[PDB]
Amino acid sequence: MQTHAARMRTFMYWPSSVPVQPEQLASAGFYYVGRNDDVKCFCCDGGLRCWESGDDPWVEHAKWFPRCEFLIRMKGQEFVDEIQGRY
Numbered sequence: 560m561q562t563h564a565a566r567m568r569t570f571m572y573w574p575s576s577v578p579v580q581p582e583q584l585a586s587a588g589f590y591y592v593g594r595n596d597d598v599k600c601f602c603c604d605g606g607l608r609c610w611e612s613g614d615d616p617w618v619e620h621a622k623w624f625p626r627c628e629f630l631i632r633m634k635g636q637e638f639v640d641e642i643q644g645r646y
């Protein structure tokens with residue numbers, strides 16, 4: 560699940576009702592595990608479910624799994640710090 564294309568392919572059977580797009584999930588390192596709306600990050604193995612309207616996957620990534628190596632490398636410690644309430 561190291562590549563964007565491999566993560567995107569797992570969303571081929573992603574439910575239509577979920578108000579979060581596969582493109583944005585896969586960019587933030589998530590892939591659909593083929594269960595409800597459960598996704599896991601390829602890097603930290605952080606699991607996320609119950610995706611609501613207006614959810615930004617990068618924000619959810621930094622909110623619940625701030626120590627993820629991929630999240631830090633892509634978004635940076637400053638972004639992670641902000642999401643954790645540190646300005």
Ligand SMILES: [Zn+2]
Pocket residue numbers: 588600601602603604605620624627628629630
């Ligand atoms: Zn992660």
